[PDB]
């Protein structure tokens, strides 16, 4: 109803702006221990914006100058997208163990994880078991048979990462277990990650 949104709506979101709209939420997963929220708007955003700019080229599909530039920017975009998904592929390809368990805690919406990832992941875990098929499956585990209880991959949430200040330059004391006394706006007092899976889901703070 209330128009004029940063999404694909009744206003111009620049290719530069569509860079902005998820650049940080890619950089976070670069520097991180566990999975972060999923996003899905991109899949229609990119393909829409990119196709429109493509056809805008496609009229003048011979040039040397600006057709070329548009192509270059497009390639930069695809680098970023492939990189995001490379990392998340990697983390769940590792973390097929108890990632499923938070998901059966709620099975979140597009927030936490995405469905095709789930198909991917359960397909894989079936593969591992039906590969172990041709190892020891006259005597496959007599108790710990399927997806197991001590077999874990990515539980750890204290990989001490760098945090970027962006808020009240005084100690705006906010959600974290530790003594985040002496918070600020352009500073950092580094800490673990478990204690803040909060501000970055608030996007109060950022990573570096």
């Amino acid at each position: 109803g209330l128009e004029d949104e940063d999404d694909d709506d009744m206003e111009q979101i620049t290719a530069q702006k569509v860079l902005e709209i998820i650049e940080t939420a890619w950089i976070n997963e670069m520097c991180a221990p566990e999975i972060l929220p999923s996003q899905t708007d991109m899949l229609e955003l990119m393909v829409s914006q990119v196709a429109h700019m493509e056809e805008q080229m496609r009229d003048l599909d011979k040039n040397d100058f600006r057709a070329v530039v548009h192509s270059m920017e497009l390639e930069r975009v695809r680098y970023i997208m492939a990189s995001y998904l490379r990392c998340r592929l990697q983390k769940i390809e590792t973390f097929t163990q108890h990632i499923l368990n938070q998901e059966e805690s709620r099975e979140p919406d597009d927030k936490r994880l995405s469905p095709e990832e789930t198909k991917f992941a359960q397909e894989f875990a079936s593969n591992v078991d039906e590969y172990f098929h041709k190892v020891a499956t006259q005597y496959m585990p007599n108790q710990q048979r399927g997806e197991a209880e001590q077999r874990i991959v990515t539980p750890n949430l204290m990989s001490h990462v760098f945090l970027k200040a962006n808020v009240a330059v005084p100690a705006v004391i906010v959600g974290v277990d530790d003594e985040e006394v002496d918070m600020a706006a352009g500073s950092q007092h580094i800490i673990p990650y478990q204690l803040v899976a909060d501000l970055i889901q608030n996007n109060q703070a950022q990573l570096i």
Partner: peptide
């Protein structure tokens, strides 16, 4: 002291030269 550090007028091209070493 992993609740106390410096960034206040840091730049980034210096810090990535350390990053993988210490924390892991």
């Amino acid at each position: 002291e992993g609740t106390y550090a410096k960034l206040d007028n840091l730049t980034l091209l210096e810090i990535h030269s350390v990053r993988p070493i210490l924390p892991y």
